Amino acid sequence: RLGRQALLFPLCLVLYEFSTYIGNDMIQPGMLAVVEQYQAGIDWVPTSMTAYLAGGMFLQWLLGPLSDRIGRRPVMLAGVVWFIVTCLAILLAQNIEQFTLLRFLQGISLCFIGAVGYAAIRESFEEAVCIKITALMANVALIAPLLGPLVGAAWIHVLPWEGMFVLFAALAAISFFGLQRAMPETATRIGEKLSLKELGRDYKLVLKNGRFVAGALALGFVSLPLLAWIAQSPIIIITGEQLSSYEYGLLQVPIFGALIAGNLLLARLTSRRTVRSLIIMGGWPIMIGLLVAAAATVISSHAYLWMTAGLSIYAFGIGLANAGLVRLTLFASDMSKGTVSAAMGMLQMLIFTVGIEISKHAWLNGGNGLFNLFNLVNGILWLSLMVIFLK
Numbered sequence: 406r407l408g409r410q411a412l413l414f415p416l417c418l419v420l421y422e423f424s425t426y427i428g429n430d431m432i433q434p435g436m437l438a439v440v441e442q443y444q445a446g447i448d449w450v451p452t453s454m455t456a457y458l459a460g461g462m463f464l465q466w467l468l469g470p471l472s473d474r475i476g477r478r479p480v481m482l483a484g485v486v487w488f489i490v491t492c493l494a495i496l497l498a499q500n501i502e503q504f505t506l507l508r509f510l511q512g513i514s515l516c517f518i519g520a521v522g523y524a525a526i527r528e529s530f531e532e533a534v535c536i537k538i539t540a541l542m543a544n545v546a547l548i549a550p551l552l553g554p555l556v557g558a559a560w561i562h563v564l565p566w567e568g569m570f571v572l573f574a575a576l577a578a579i580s581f582f583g584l585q586r587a588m589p590e591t592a593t594r595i596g597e598k599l600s601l602k603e604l605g606r607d608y609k610l611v612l613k614n615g616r617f618v619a620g621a622l623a624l625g626f627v628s629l630p631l632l633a634w635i636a637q638s639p640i641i642i643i644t645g646e647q648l649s650s651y652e653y654g655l656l657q658v659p660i661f662g663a664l665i666a667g668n669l670l671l672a673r674l675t676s677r678r679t680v681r682s683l684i685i686m687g688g689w690p691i692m693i694g695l696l697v698a699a700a701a702t703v704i705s706s707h708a709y710l711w712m713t714a715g716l717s718i719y720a721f722g723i724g725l726a727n728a729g730l731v732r733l734t735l736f737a738s739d740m741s742k743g744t745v746s747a748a749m750g751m752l753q754m755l756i757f758t759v760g761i762e763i764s765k766h767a768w769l770n771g772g773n774g775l776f777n778l779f780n781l782v783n784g785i786l787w788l789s790l791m792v793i794f795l796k
């Protein structure tokens with residue numbers, strides 16, 4: 406059962422990952438239907454993603470050391486079950502507030518992927534095989550924001566939005582049974598005590614590292630325009646520009662195609678290039694992309710093609726530079742990779758959570774110009790942290 410069929414474990418971890426990612430990505434275009442069904446304002450549309458990501462930073466710090474003490478199996482499986490239950494519970498929401506609360510509770514399921522599931526992969530599989538699994542997880546995470554809005558935009562013309570959550574729960578159910586028969590128990594620290602004050606001691610120690618913080622924050626700021634696009638794309642395009650769901654879906658193609666193209670180029674150049682130079686290389690289309698989108702929409706607020714072009718060029722730089730910065734940020738601290746991962750995960754989520762809300766009020770008040778102007782300052786914040794980060 407060990408050699409061939411142990412791949413069911415990473416496979417099911419991947420499937421669970423995908424279901425939680427489209428859990429955000431399929432829902433965003435569906436938020437228009439949701440918000441119309443509850444008769445709520447369009448300002449709750451991006452907040453759906455905010456609450457989801459806020460839930461993802463909630464148990465982050467806790468899950469890694471906890472699953473180390475009580476085992477990774479019961480923690481991972483409990484997480485998948487929690488995702489299924491919360492996905493089904495949102496059908497009873499009855500209110501946009503309660504909908505957002507359950508959105509938050511769903512987001513907690515995100516914490517289980519990296520802190521426990523992936524920790525088990527790192528423990529179960531050799532550094533060799535681990536690399537491939539991480540690559541598969543990276544590929545899938547690239548496919549979600551590309552396919553999700555496409556499928557989601559089509560879904561609301563056929564089936565009710567409630568059906569999407571039944572879909573996520575279904576895919577998660579498959580991962581559950583798979584993981585239940587596949588995932589090994591890798592936890593070393595059973596049954597050792599868990600000290601919250603010593604745990605908090607570790608997080609205060611990583612936050613004292615100057616280079617780490619700069620790199621972790623930079624990851625947040627630089628990816629914020631992309632996530633803000635994902636969050637606000639339905640209301641910017643469909644409600645704001647009065648375009649259709651077909652145009653909405655079409656515009657996602659050059660943007661996330663360029664993201665993928667960026668990673669593909671990254672994969673080809675990684676042997677002859679150093680992550681430091683990849684950052685500088687990705688830096689150009691990132692700054693130019695954000696500049697083009699801001700400038701064009703300050704001139705003419707209604708040009709979404711210039712904005713999309715800009716976001717596409719920027720997403721290409723992201724694909725190239727980001728995986729590199731993740732490595733450097735990880736290796737900028739000598740502490741436990743679990744504590745380090747959770748810290749940078751939470752720092753990014755904080756920037757995403759607050760950033761999406763800020764981005765929302767930017768667009769509500771100033772339209773597209775302000776949306777892109779705020780995305781531009783985020784790029785400059787990333788650039789600013791880069792000159793510090795190296796050297």
Ligand SMILES: O=C(N[C@H](CO)[C@H](O)c1ccc([N+](=O)[O-])cc1)C(Cl)Cl
Nearest residue numbers: 425426429430546547549550628635
């Ligand atoms: O960030 C998330 N989801 C985003 C938006 O839904 C999406 O899945 C995504 C995935 C990868 C990515 N990337 O590689 O830069 C960006 C967004 C959370 Cl589900 Cl972790």
